[PDB]
Amino acid sequence: NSVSVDLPGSMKVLVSKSSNADGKYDLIATVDALELSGTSDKNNGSGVLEGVKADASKVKLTISDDLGQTTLEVFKSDGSTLVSKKVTSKDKVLGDVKFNEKGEVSEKIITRADGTRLEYTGIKSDGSGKAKEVLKGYVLEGTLTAEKTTLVVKEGTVTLSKNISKSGAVSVELNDTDSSAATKKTAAWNSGTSTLTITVNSKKTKDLVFTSSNTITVQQYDSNGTSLEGSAVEITKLDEIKNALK
């Protein structure tokens, strides 16, 4: 009579085995406690379903066949003022948006495939806000502007900035207010190798690699910067990152 299709999270959409006389399928989905009903032109789990909460909130679940993306929208009773929006990509990246009482965006958390998070709070009408990145073993603090996310690690006169553009590209910069030409750090970034090379008085001192695993590794150069030494050490603690900036 019907068959189940599993979706990101608990969500399981039950689709009818065959279409109705107008060529459309019946969909029933369970999302936590809510029962949603809707339709689709296919029986692969795509479609649009709607329901109502116990407090009269309106809910809409959209499963798109072009992106594999699922969008869960919770509205006020008018079915138009947003209360929350949950989007899960094919890549299992989760974006969870909260809205103020006027239905405008005020917070967004992105949860990555591996479980690390970008957290945007105090979002303002201009797209700025506060930003935090939650990694394995430590948390980075920074700011959001419409242009980019900037997470900062400070150590004395040195500021390490990790920038994330709207599209998700990463650039890393180092800024040192040290006035001594013998100790001031500068740095060069390569996005293809995801490596920041730190230089002190014309000598390369370390490479910081920002890995696909959302980790940071550090590897030392020799005393006159003429070759890498040893092997890269994966950073597990914020104290280790700051130490590399000394």
State the CATH number of the domain containing residue 26.
2.40.128.160
**Resolution of the experimental model, in Å, one decimal:** 1.9
Q: Which residues pair with 209 in a beta bridge?
A: 195, 217
Q: C-alpha distances in angstroms, 210 versus 51, 139, 145?
A: 43, 15, 22
- Are residues 108 and 215 located together in one domain of the fold? yes
- Are residues 178 and 134 located together in one domain of the fold? yes
- Are residues 144 and 241 located together in one domain of the fold? yes
Query: 56 in helix, strand or coil?
Result: coil
Look at the alpha carbons of 137, 143, 148, 154 in this order and tell me if their dihedral is positive or negative. Answer: negative
Residue 105: name the closest of 88, 126, 87, 90 by CA. Answer: 126
Query: 126 in helix, strand or coil?
Result: coil
Quick one: tokens of 175? Answer: 């800024």
Would you say how long the chain is, in residues?
A: 246
- Are residues 112 and 214 located together in one domain of the fold? yes
Q: Tell me whether residue 10 is exposed, middle or buried, using C-beta atoms within 10 angstroms of its C-beta: 0 to 12, 13 to 18, 19 or more.
A: exposed
- Are residues 86 and 201 located together in one domain of the fold? no
Residue 158: name the closest of 196, 209, 213 by CA. Answer: 196
Distance (Å, whole) CA 62 – CA 39: 10
Q: Tell me whether residue 71 is exposed, middle or buried, using C-beta atoms within 10 angstroms of its C-beta: 0 to 12, 13 to 18, 19 or more.
A: middle
Look at the alpha carbons of 4, 6, 7, 9 in this order and tell me if their dihedral is positive or negative. Answer: positive
Last residue of a domain, one of 100, 121, 149: 100
Q: Which residues pair with 163 in a beta bridge?
A: 150, 171
- Are residues 108 and 63 located together in one domain of the fold? no
Last residue of a domain, one of 70, 100, 130: 100
- Are residues 89 and 205 located together in one domain of the fold? no
- Are residues 113 and 84 located together in one domain of the fold? no
Q: Find out whether 185 and 160 touch, Cβ atoms under 8 Å.
A: no
- Are residues 231 and 177 located together in one domain of the fold? yes
Q: Find out whether 26 and 56 touch, Cβ atoms under 8 Å.
A: no
Q: How was this structure determined?
A: X-ray
Helices and strands (H and E) in the chain: how many: 1, 21
Q: C-alpha distances in angstroms, 185 versus 53, 173, 201?
A: 57, 11, 8
- Are residues 236 and 136 located together in one domain of the fold? yes
Rg over CA atoms, the chain: 24
Distance (Å, whole) CA 16 – CA 166: 40
Last residue of a domain, one of 85, 100, 115: 100
Domain that holds residue 147: 101-246
- CATH (domain of 146): 3.90.930.1
- Are residues 22 and 80 located together in one domain of the fold? yes
- Are residues 118 and 227 located together in one domain of the fold? yes
Number of structural domains, the chain?
Answer: 2
